[PDB]
Amino acid sequence: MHYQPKQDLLNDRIILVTGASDGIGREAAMTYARYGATVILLGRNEEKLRQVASHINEETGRQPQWFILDLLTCTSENCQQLAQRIAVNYPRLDGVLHNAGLLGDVCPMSEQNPQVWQDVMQVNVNATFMLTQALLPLLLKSDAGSLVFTSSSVGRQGRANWGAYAASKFATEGMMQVLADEYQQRLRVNCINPGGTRTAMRASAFPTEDPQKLKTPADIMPLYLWLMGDDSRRKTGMTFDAQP
Amino acid sequence: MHYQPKQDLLNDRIILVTGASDGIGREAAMTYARYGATVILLGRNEEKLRQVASHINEETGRQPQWFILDLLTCTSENCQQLAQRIAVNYPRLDGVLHNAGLLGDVCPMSEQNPQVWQDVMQVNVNATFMLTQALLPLLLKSDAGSLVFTSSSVGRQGRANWGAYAASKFATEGMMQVLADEYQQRLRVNCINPGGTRTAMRASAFPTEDPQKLKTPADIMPLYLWLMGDDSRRKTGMTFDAQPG
């Protein structure tokens, strides 16, 4: 969207952001905080989470909490324990933004590494599901909870070389649709496709392209904001392109 | 699919069928054999595979060979070993029908069991991929190899209660589309949604449903035949309903 919201759009909204230590997740966490949100940072790297929390505190005067979770390795019980810890400190979650993900191999199906394939599915699908499941009770405590998954163009139309990532993002669209159906009139559940954005992940899929022509995570934030604020309250079951 | 193929549609065509002891798998294997195919059965239950092979032999006069693979626990190396075993006895694969699958839990997302979810994804997506990868060289040796995945309506539009199965069948559609793009003008890669059929899995999903309101696996075979015979040689990248609205 060319979306220009009020600077207090997310005042008194508690939003959890995964993959918050770098890339799009870091930018979304900072952006949400700049628009008034109380942000909860999830990531695998403690020192990077502490740094992001410190930066957000410098820009907002409000210090985010962070929690460690590695989606490659976490079990359901790890996710449940995390949700319990969040619930001690927070009365609800108004938003959950799933940004964490693994790209894996960009190469033909005949060459895909099966262990990498399994890991892409584990992070992007299984652990993303398990974390969602653990956080549903907190989301239901919101006046209008918003759950957002990260998708891709290759989650709508499979393309050569995109292997496990494409399969995982199709699965993500499917999971979003199941959830949107189950939580009609209860939650907003949608996907965002960030498109080609300048990130370390883009430096793997396209190791020979000029990153200078790619969009910055900051550039694609309008849609990230829109999905967490009140202007999207009447949208669920949909998948959006942050920049076609 | 009103489809009344020539009865020798699959003469001299070597077709592997996975999940070959279950309702649809055993019917597809039988049907392919009836239409002339050299059928290879794959499944986890040797006892049941032997019995399906013997039934096919009695009804059609040709006895399928079988191989054992458990998609829940197999490694990529197991799949490569299977391909080696097949290659000793068969010069190519003209078709591979991936019918094996796990339903898992039919219940809300809040109630889906995480280990079952993992198992469904492992069988339906990961091991289905690993087996495909192992079999691609044999399929490339066909004049026009046909690779068929099993999908579902919930692989096109997610619905309440279908949890891991839906996610896995979306992933299946995606994998099919990636493969179809990579193998343009080399392989045919498509999916079949069987629809609701009188099978054990369907009865598990809808325990109160009256099976008499559903078609049998035999009833839905036309599409299964069509995708393996030459009439579909210029069809790739698509997903088909065995029971159109």
UniProtKB/Swiss-Prot annotation, chain B:
Substrate binds at residue 152. Its EC number is 1.-.-.-. SMART domains: PKS_KR. The keyword Oxidoreductase applies. NADP(+) binds at residues 16-40. InterPro entries: NAD(P)-bd_dom_sf, Sc_DH/Rdtase_CS, SDR_fam, YciK. Keywords: Oxidoreductase. GO terms for molecular function: oxidoreductase activity. Pfam families: adh_short. Gene3D superfamilies: NAD(P)-binding Rossmann-like Domain (3.40.50.720). Belongs to the short-chain dehydrogenases/reductases (SDR) family. NCBIfam families: PRK08945.1. This is Uncharacterized oxidoreductase YciK. The lineage of its organism: Bacteria, Pseudomonadati, Pseudomonadota, Gammaproteobacteria, Enterobacterales.
